[PDB]
């Protein structure tokens, strides 16, 4: 026998350690066969200027095509013949390259990764081959209404800030982008302390730490003159950006109010509140018997195709709300039932309700951590986000502190009378007027 709690306390702690330059070394051990070593660099899309808006994102395409030590196909053929998989993902705040492999392959793994971060053989040919490809990718991104709409939400959420640009990077910059510029970018932002080299599975921390090629380090200040935040707040703006295209079949709306950064008591409590609203699809087996009254109502009344609440965590700001897809004739009822669930949450939360949304959160947050790659991520990212902590076991404690009053007062700070940030892509003709959305944030009636 063994019980949830117990389990929790019995999970393998994460070892954070540090190289002379500030290379961060984490790892969770399990002594099992495949490993997923990763380097989680944290200079993303929000450091890019207007020009280099998609500079990082470009580096990514180059990341795996050569290293002075491995021109051409070397990288890949090396990864392949081992049977390892190599992925690059880039956000607006975090770039990240990682390797999945057999646990005995660390030797060559970690050497490869480290090689990748630093030496990237980039010729005029590869730059001009990657331009054409990203211009094509942009063209394909436009085909995506989810993507197109969430970009919009950031743009308008954060008008006139560096964080509202498209990771992908503004079309034409790609054309223009000077070859020198990639350098400056990397040089300036790939310098840990920023980066963390994390990993999970069968490895011994000890070795990891040791195995980190100590080759180049942060070329930065020792005093406060660095102190000028590179992470300067981004100004919060409650606008809408409506982009009508009656030629498209369905409607995409992203509504969110601004939230807190990565680190905050209120930020787990929010999750438990989104637990309650939920997330629903054309294919959910429970339709009408779902417990989230939003779900139930679109299930029952064919009100929507798919909706999903989200909490987009950033340093200086956030994005928090729902997103729904639906017919052109359904936009307003969807908007009604949604905001209505928000409001009823900050004024009428019941202990039963919060209690269920609590538990859900536990599970979402345990189940994601199944597997080596997920666990890597948690570790890597978790150290630029929340710093070095591994709050995993605390969670259940923190999660457990939620009496429904907690969930309700937390909820009202962000939602109640806050100006929502709205974005949709036609047919939006029925999408509420900004003033209607707004008064949808208080409760006189409706």
């Amino acid at each position: 026998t063994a019980t949830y709690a117990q389990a929790l306390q019995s999970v393998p702690e994460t070892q954070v350690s540090q190289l002379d330059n500030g290379l961060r070394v984490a790892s969770e051990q399990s002594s099992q066969p495949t490993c997923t070593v990763g380097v989680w660099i944290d200079a993303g899309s929000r450091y890019e200027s207007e020009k280099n808006n998609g500079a990082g994102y470009f580096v990514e395409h180059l990341a795996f095509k050569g290293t002075k030590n491995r021109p051409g196909n070397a990288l890949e053929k090396e990864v392949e013949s081992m049977g390892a998989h190599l992925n690059a993902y880039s956000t607006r705040e975090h770039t990240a390259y990682y390797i999945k492999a057999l646990s005995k392959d660390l030797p060559k793994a970690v050497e490869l990764l480290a090689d990748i971060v630093q030496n990237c053989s980039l010729e005029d040919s590869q730059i001009e081959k990657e331009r054409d490809v990203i211009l094509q990718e942009l063209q394909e991104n436009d085909t995506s209404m989810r993507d197109v709409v969430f970009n919009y939400l950031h743009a308008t959420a954060f008008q006139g800030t560096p964080l509202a640009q498209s990771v992908e990077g503004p079309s034409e910059n790609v054309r223009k982008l000077s070859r020198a510029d990639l350098t400056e970018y990397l040089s300036r932002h790939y310098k840990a302390p920023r980066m963390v080299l994390a990993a999970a599975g069968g490895l011994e921390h000890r070795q990891l730490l040791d195995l980190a090629q100590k080759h180049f380090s942060g070329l930065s200040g020792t005093y406060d003159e660095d102190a000028v935040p590179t992470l300067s707040p981004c100004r919060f703006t409650g606008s809408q950006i409506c982009h009508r295209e009656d030629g498209l079949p369905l409607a995409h709306v992203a509504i969110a109010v601004e939230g807190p950064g990565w680190a905050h008591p209120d930020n787990v409590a929010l999750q438990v509140a989104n637990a309650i609203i939920g997330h629903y699809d054309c294919t959910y087996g429970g339709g009408a018997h779902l417990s989230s009254p939003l779900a139930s109502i679109a299930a029952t009344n064919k009100l929507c195709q798919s909706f999903q609440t989200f909490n987009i965590c950033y340093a200086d700001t956030g994005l928090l709300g729902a997103h729904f897809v639906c017919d052109h004739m359904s936009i307003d009822d969807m908007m009604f039932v949604l905001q209505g669930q928000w409001m009823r949450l900050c004024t009428s939360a019941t202990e039963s309700e919060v209690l269920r949304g609590k538990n859900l959160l536990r599970n979402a947050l345990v189940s994601h951590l199944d597997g080596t790659t997920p666990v890597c991520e948690d570790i890597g990212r978790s150290l630029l986000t929340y710093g070095r902590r591994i709050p995993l076991a605390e969670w259940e404690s923190r999660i457990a502190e939620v009496d429904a009053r907690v969930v309700r007062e937390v909820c009202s700070k962000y939602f109640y009378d806050q100006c929502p940030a709205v974005a949709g892509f036609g047919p939006i003709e029925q999408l509420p007027d900004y003033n209607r959305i707004r008064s949808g944030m208080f409760w006189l009636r409706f």
């Binding site: 004024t347 009428s348 939360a349 019941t350 309700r408």
Partner: peptide, 22 residues
């Protein structure tokens, strides 16, 4: 829940309203 508090302010309002108004 929040109804008592809110019903209490709503009861206040009606009261003072009559009192004054009337």
């Amino acid at each position: 829940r929040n109804w008592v508090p809110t019903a209490q302010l709503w009861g206040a309002v009606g009261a003072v309203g009559l009192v004054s108004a009337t």
